[PDB]
Design a binder for this molecule. Structure first.
Ligand SMILES: CCCCCCCCCCCCCCCCCC(=O)OC[C@H](COP(=O)([O-])OCC[N+](C)(C)C)OC(=O)CCCCCCCCCCCCCCCCC
Ligand SMILES: CCCCCCCCCCCCCCCCCC(=O)OC[C@H](COP(=O)([O-])OCC[N+](C)(C)C)OC(=O)CCCCCCCCCCCCCCCCC
Ligand SMILES: CCCCCCCCCCCCCCCCCC(=O)OC[C@H](COP(=O)([O-])OCC[N+](C)(C)C)OC(=O)CCCCCCCCCCCCCCCCC
Ligand SMILES: CCCCCCCCCCCCCCCCCC(=O)OC[C@H](COP(=O)([O-])OCC[N+](C)(C)C)OC(=O)CCCCCCCCCCCCCCCCC
Ligand SMILES: CCCCCCCCCCCCCCCCCC(=O)OC[C@H](COP(=O)([O-])OCC[N+](C)(C)C)OC(=O)CCCCCCCCCCCCCCCCC
Ligand SMILES: CCCCCCCCCCCCCCCCCC(=O)OC[C@H](COP(=O)([O-])OCC[N+](C)(C)C)OC(=O)CCCCCCCCCCCCCCCCC
Ligand SMILES: NC(=O)c1ccc[n+]([C@@H]2O[C@H](COP(=O)([O-])OP(=O)(O)OC[C@H]3O[C@@H](n4cnc5c(N)ncnc54)[C@H](OP(=O)(O)O)[C@@H]3O)[C@@H](O)[C@H]2O)c1
Ligand SMILES: NC(=O)c1ccc[n+]([C@@H]2O[C@H](COP(=O)([O-])OP(=O)(O)OC[C@H]3O[C@@H](n4cnc5c(N)ncnc54)[C@H](O)[C@@H]3O)[C@@H](O)[C@H]2O)c1
Ligand SMILES: CCCCCCCCCCCC
Ligand SMILES: CCCCCCCCCCCC
Lengths: 1038, 90
């Protein structure tokens, strides 16, 4: 049997108070709704809350029963606001009106009332004391003395004014400068800080003081002026309190207060030491030296007083300086006092028996500090008449032992401060001298002038590509990816100049060139359609009508300006390459505002069209070979247009992984082809070695790009398993492959034969494909978006290897522009986590800020709610931030989320989105999926722009994200994600986390925000719960 | 800033106000009886030059408030904005 007596057989009681001018009541009706929800029966005396302004109708409508005066104290629970005393109306003491085995909840003060404990022990009752609850961490929701101190501080401020005959604020009107009032607060506990807040927010300036060292920091945090004294001895009071200071400290503090007392206007004193009187801190001559009309408030008038002139309860004028000395100060705000004291009693009785229909509260004295048995034994001062008031000491002492671990930035500080100023300058000068000697090394190896000019335009186009892709908006990183895939289809330029014969190919090089032109036209058409489809989803329906067809006006006079010169006897190809390169720069530069994003697709189309027109008209092809060229480009473009239209947007990474392979293959199919078409010319050429170096490197880069992007497509689609397949010896194998690939250029030189050169080309293509498959299949399916971007850089540099080889400026400008884009995107993504590229590619444990092992454990249990409490707690909020992850989009939940955000923005709320930089399967995927759902782009914010708006936020909905909101990245240096920048969602009021079951993510074995008191779990699939929230907001408001 | 569903120009000759129509006063008292059941403190400062202050709150409009509200009348000299105001006392 459960060892308690059930809730139905018990009855609480709310008597009135016969103590003089007493106004607050023990239970508000909000505390009568509770305890009837719990299970007690409530009876209330008839005249009980009129002084606290609670009518009897609210007690009748809360479930209680209005009854008399003798049969309320004869209840199983008796709930008072102060101790029982002599009742002159009934002529009997109240302790004789209690029943035999009752229970009393009161301020007892057992060290001061021995006769009360005698009269209660003669009645054989159990008495709990709201006084004797210890000040610990888990018992601060029920601390009645702190509540009454807060109310006394606010009431001392609002009684300082209405007796002080000037303003507190002080304005500069056009009628005279009025200065602010000056208020001094002796002693900041709860009442002192309440007075400092109420006086600082009203307009005055505060210059408070306390002897403890922490209360001065609390004063400085509230905005006051912490005062200092010269005799600098220790603030005593073990346990976090105050003792009685030395006599020299007191006569120095009174010197400080006498110097400060001539200039302040309101003096609120709250000095109070436990177990003694309040210290006299102000003399008569010290307080008669104030300005006439000053207000002096004494909050310690019950236990002595801090003044030599305080009548405890009067407001005598005393030559101007008015003294306020009331001893029952929370009784004048009895509504607030009754509500807070009812909350304290309700949260006490909810906590001492956390059980249904039983009521037990075991009183034992094993004394684990911090636990609740401490609270139970310290609170109960009498059990069955036998008094147990001196509570013995707790066994261990936690909560005051400094063993606190530093945060992760504090461990990064000793790494940032151990690097001497000499070594920073030494490694900087080393980087610059290595760069300058590499420039000299490229200078020595130059065979001719065209190589030097092409290295010059390569370096300048690299710097242009560096600056122009940091400027793009982080909401448009995936249209940037699509634009670079569209412009990387200019390997058709390398295919058209090696494409010869007639309507059909003649030799094998001319068929390799036709293959390259075909798959590059696939790249061109596919990339421009997916870019135009993605940029039409950011178009808000309230935007003005744009007229994009007007950008046919430059195109129609650019290439139309070319052919009219081409039918004139001019040769404009080296300048058309510059114009096409500038248009492709403007394709990426315009994609940086969201208002110029459609210009950044049209200029890329103009650039690709001008480049193809220049390379098509600078060859002068015969009408059957031009027919072959146009047929290859038309068939490739047709396949690209029909692929780039049927896809969904969520399948967009796979297509991006499908493009780089077609950029890789074509690169290989160019380089081998130019080894064939220029083999009989290596005898009579001085640049015969450069065009073999560049062919070898382009074949290597294309062979890595092709196979790596093919494995990336296979692992994103779901064909290959998304687990990192690790070979037994994989670093030795990769180093052997790289050694064979680097050392194969030595048989490729030193031998002018054709069979040796073509077998070195085939061998380096095969070894590069095997190296791509080997390096890509050991990554893992979650950091696969690195492989999307790194190969995106490689598909850039292959273009440069196709531009160095063909002596073409447009290919090198475009290749630098794409390689810099891929490298900067992979940098942003490696720095958005805290891993390096060697940490991701080669495979490493964790993060370059973790240390040692043994991550710290988990603590507590998780709060779990349902749809109804979640929707009621949405309706209470007025500012919501939603953090989506990939679980929102894998379940196709962005459409009811978009409709829900639309409904909540129709009702004046502030609903914004917060995006982590690596949330998704591609850079910037989640922005585009929210744009397809229908969300305007102005309420979608990045991580850096929303991160400081979390403390001023009523509600945070975390939908399908685990690692990007994990607090162990900032407070556990042994974690697997330690140092990763995360969305700090715990700093808001309330967090709802929606997920299937309490498990893991991709790493970080347990999430400490799930076991946190300001976080409620809402389990279930995201699609069903978001549809449920949409239906409840629709059917509750419309 | 509150609002009523009648568009009448409140200004008179200059920056001062003028007397309102009876229908506008009835609509304003409808607004005040609607939002008199939700507020805790109310301060009426209405004062029209030339004559006495307009009555804006009935004796049954003000008794529908919560038990414990404070009602401050800064027009108690020149009439008052309440039909329940002793013009010099609490
Ligand atoms: C083939 C020849 C290639 C020639 C390249 C010349 C340009 C490279 C050096 C200058 C650009 C990088 C830079 O500013 O680095 C300084 C910075 C100094 O950093 P910092 O501490 O002074 O920070 C201020 C400078 N910013 C913010 C721009 C970084 O160091 C690095 O960036 C470290 C990595 C350097 C990687 C390149 C090494 C040199 C090139 C070697 C080529 C092969 C031999
Ligand atoms: C023949 C082959 C020659 C190859 C030459 C390669 C040079 C590489 C060294 C330069 C690295 C960038 C400069 C240093 C730096 O700031 O690094 C930190 C930067 C990050 O900068 P950051 O964050 O330190 O600086 C602040 C920048 N904002 C304010 C915009 C955020 O790292 C990267 O950008 C990573 C990619 C590096 C560059 C990729 C290539 C683009 C330029 C190519 C030029 C040659 C073609
Ligand atoms: C439409 C494409 C043809 C436009 C007609 C003008 C261009 C032209 O002169 O073509 C003849 C040229 C031959 O040049 P051409 O030798 O006739 O040069 C003109 C010389 N006079 C004026 C003396 C006759 O044909 C080509 O260049 C074939 C390739 C056309 C590339 C078209 C690119 C856009 C598609
Ligand atoms: C000869 C007459 C030439 C007249 C100009 C020809 C322009 C042809 C089309 C260029 C389109 C791309 C422009 C561009 O890069 O804009 C980026 C930007 C505008 O975008 P943005 O740079 O402001 O974008 C914001 C990005 N952050 C925040 C990083 C700055 O414009 C420039 O950089 C202008 C610099 C001068 C460019 C002048 C033309 C090229 C140089 C001369 C070539 C001929 C000699
Ligand atoms: C017509 C007068 C003579 C001009 C001749 C000039 C030479 C040909 C130049 C063609 C390139 C485009 C010119 C600049 C942009 C014009 C404005 C524009 O497109 O706005 C978007 C406009 C309006 O977009 P929207 O936002 O209204 O969306 C509606 C989309 N559609 C029409 C598909 C339902 O869209 C289109 O024009 C169609 C979609 C974009 C193109 C998709 C296929 C791209 C294929 C590869 C690109 C071309 C590469 C070069 C190959 C040779 C081409 C001939
Ligand atoms: C035929 C012609 C072929 C020409 C080939 C030209 C190749 C040019 C290569 C350009 C890329 C150079 C990358 C330098 C990165 C330096 C970053 C850095 O400072 O790291 C320290 C930082 C240290 O962390 P941090 O947070 O302190 O960042 C530094 C910030 N400051 C400077 C302000 C203090 O390391 C990281 O952030 C970790 C990740 C580093 C690597 C991230 C990816 C780099 C880009 C790789 C893309 C792929 C390259 C392809 C090469 C192709 C070769 C054929
Ligand atoms: N985006 C990029 O470019 C990029 C690049 C490199 C690496 N990454 C990786 O991306 C990760 C992103 O971290 P993250 O926290 O967003 O992801 P996450 O931790 O892997 O997943 C978030 C959680 O959502 C839940 N979930 C999954 N499918 C769901 C569905 N259909 N309905 C409801 N809940 C669902 C899962 O929990 P339950 O199954 O337990 O319910 C999962 O743990 C990074 O940690 C990084 O490793 C990204
Ligand atoms: N959650 C929590 O951490 C929590 C909750 C409640 C209370 N507390 C602790 O309990 C105390 C709350 O203060 P209180 O107001 O309830 O107690 P109190 O009534 O004893 O406060 C009197 C104040 O006067 C100060 N004082 C004493 N002698 C003085 C002198 N000679 N000159 C100047 N100032 C003097 C004391 O330092 C104290 O701040 C603090 O120590 C606080 O840290 C903590
Ligand atoms: C890393 C940049 C190229 C370094 C070249 C070093 C010197 C090569 C000489 C080749 C024979 C002229
Ligand atoms: C022996 C002559 C070697 C000439 C080429 C050296 C390497 C140049 C590389 C330039 C970038 C691809």
């Amino acid at each position: 049997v459960k060892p308690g007596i059930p809730y139905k057989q018990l009855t609480v009681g709310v008597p009135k108070e016969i103590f003089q001018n007493e106004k607050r009541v023990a239970l508000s009706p909000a505390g009568v709704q509770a305890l009837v929800k719990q299970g007690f029966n409530v009876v209330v005396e008839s005249g009980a809350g009129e002084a606290s302004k609670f009518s009897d109708d609210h007690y009748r409508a809360a479930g209680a029963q209005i009854q008399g005066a003798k049969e309320v104290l004869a209840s199983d629970l008796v709930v008072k606001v102060r101790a029982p005393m002599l009742n002159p109306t009934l002529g009997i003491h109240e302790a004789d009106l209690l029943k035999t085995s009752g229970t009393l909840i009161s301020f007892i003060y057992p060290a001061q009332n021995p006769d009360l404990l005698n009269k209660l022990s003669k009645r054989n009752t159990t008495v709990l004391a709201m006084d004797q609850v210890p000040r610990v961490t888990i018992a601060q929701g029920y601390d009645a003395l702190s509540s009454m101190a807060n109310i006394a501080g606010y009431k001392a401020v609002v009684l300082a004014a209405n007796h002080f005959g000037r303003f507190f604020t002080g304005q500069i009107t056009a009628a005279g400068k009025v200065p602010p009032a000056k208020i001094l607060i002796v002693g900041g506990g709860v009442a002192g800080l309440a007075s400092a807040g109420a006086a600082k927010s009203m307009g005055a300036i505060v210059r408070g003081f306390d002897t403890r060292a922490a209360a001065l920091e609390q004063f400085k945090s509230l905005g006051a002026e912490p005062l200092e004294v010269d005799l600098k001895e220790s603030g005593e009071g073990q346990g976090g309190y105050a003792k009685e200071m030395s006599k020299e400290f007191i006569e120095a503090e009174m010197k400080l207060f006498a110097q400060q007392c001539k200039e302040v206007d309101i003096l609120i004193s709250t000095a109070l030491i436990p177990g003694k009187k309040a210290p006299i801190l102000f003399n008569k001559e010290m307080i008669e030296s104030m300005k006439e009309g000053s207000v002096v408030v004494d909050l310690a008038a019950e236990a002595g007083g801090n003044f030599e002139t305080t009548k405890p309860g009067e407001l005598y004028v005393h030559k101007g300086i008015t003294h306020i000395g009331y001893t029952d100060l929370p009784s004048r705000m009895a509504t607030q006092a009754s509500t807070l004291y009812s909350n304290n009693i309700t949260k006490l009785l909810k906590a001492i028996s956390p059980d249904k229909d039983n009521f037990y509260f075991e009183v034992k004295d094993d004394f684990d500090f911090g636990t609740m048995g401490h609270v139970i034994r310290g609170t109960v001062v009498m059990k069955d008449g036998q008094v147990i008031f001196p509570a013995p000491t707790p066994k261990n002492i936690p909560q005051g032992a400094p063993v606190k671990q530093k945060t992760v930035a504090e461990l990064e500080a000793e790494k940032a401060a151990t690097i001497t100023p000499f070594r920073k300058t030494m490694t900087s000068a080393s980087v610059y001298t290595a760069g300058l000697t590499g420039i000299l090394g490229l200078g020595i190896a130059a065979p001719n002038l065209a190589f030097s000019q092409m290295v010059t335009t390569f370096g300048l186009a690299g710097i242009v590509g560096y600056h122009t892709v940091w400027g793009v908006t982080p909401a448009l990183h995936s249209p940037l990816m699509s634009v670079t895939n569209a412009i990387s289809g200019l390997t058709a330029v390398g295919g058209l100049v090696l494409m010869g014969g007639h309507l059909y190919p003649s030799t094998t090089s001319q068929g390799l060139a036709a293959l390259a032109t075909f798959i590059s036209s696939v790249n061109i058409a596919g990339g421009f359609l997916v870019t135009q489809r993605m940029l039409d989803m950011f178009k808000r329906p309230t935007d003005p009508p744009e007229y994009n067809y007007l950008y046919l006006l430059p195109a129609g006079t650019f290439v139309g300006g070319y052919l009219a010169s081409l039918y004139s006897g001019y040769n404009i190809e080296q300048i058309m390459y510059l114009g096409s390169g500038l248009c492709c720069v403007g394709a990426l530069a315009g994609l940086s505002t969201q208002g110029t994003a459609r210009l950044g697709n049209a200029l890329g189309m103009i650039g690709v069209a001008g480049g193809l027109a220049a390379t098509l008209g600078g060859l002068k092809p015969c009408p059957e070979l031009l027919a072959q060229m146009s047929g290859a480009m038309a068939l490739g473009g047709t396949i690209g247009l029909t692929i780039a239209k049927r896809i969904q947007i969520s399948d967009l990474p796979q297509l991006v992984a499908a493009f780089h392979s077609l950029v890789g293959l074509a690169a290989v199919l160019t380089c081998i082809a130019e080894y064939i078409i220029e083999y009989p010319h290596f005898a009579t050429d001085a640049a015969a070695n450069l065009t073999k170096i560049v062919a070898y490197l382009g074949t290597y880069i294309g062979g890595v790009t092709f196979s790596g992007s093919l494995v990336a497509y296979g692992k994103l689609q779901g064909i290959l398993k998304s687990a990192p397949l690790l070979l037994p010896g994989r670093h030795l194998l990769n180093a052997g492959l790289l050694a064979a690939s680097v050392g194969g250029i030595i048989p490729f030189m030193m031998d002018p034969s054709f069979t040796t050169g073509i077998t070195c080309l085939g061998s380096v293509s095969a070894l590069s494909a095997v190296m791509g498959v080997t390096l890509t299949a050991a990554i893992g399916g979650a950091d696969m978006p690195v492989v999307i971007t790194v190969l995106n850089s490689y598909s850039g540099w292959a273009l440069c290897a196709e531009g160095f080889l063909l002596n073409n400026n447009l290919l090198t400008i475009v290749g630098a522009l794409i390689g810099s884009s891929g490298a900067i995107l992979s940098y942003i993504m490696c720095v958005a986590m805290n891993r390096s590229l060697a940490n991701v590619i080669l495979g490493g444990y964790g993060t370059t800020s973790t240390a040692g092992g043994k991550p710290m454990e988990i603590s507590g249990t998780h709060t779990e709610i349902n749809l109804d409490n979640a929707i009621d707690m949405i309706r209470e909020a007025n500012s919501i931030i939603i953090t989506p992850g990939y679980g929102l989009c894998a379940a196709k939940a962005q459409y009811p989320i978009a409709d829900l955000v639309k409904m909540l923005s129709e009702q004046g709320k502030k609903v914004r989105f917060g995006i982590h930089p690596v949330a998704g399967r591609m850079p910037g995927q989640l922005n585009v999926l929210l744009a397809e759902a229908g969300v305007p782009y102005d309420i979608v914010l990045e991580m850096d722009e929303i991160n400081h708006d979390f403390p001023d936020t009523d509600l945070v909905l975390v939908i399908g994200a685990n690692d990007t909101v994990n607090s162990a990245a900032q407070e556990d240096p042994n974690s697997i994600i330690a140092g990763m920048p995360v969305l700090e969602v715990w700093k808001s009021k309330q967090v709802i986390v929606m997920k299937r079951s309490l498990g893991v993510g991709y790493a970080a074995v347990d999430n400490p925000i799930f076991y946190k008191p300001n976080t409620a779990m809402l389990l279930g699939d995201a699609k069903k719960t978001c549809d449920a929230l949409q239906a409840k907001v629709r059917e509750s408001y419309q």
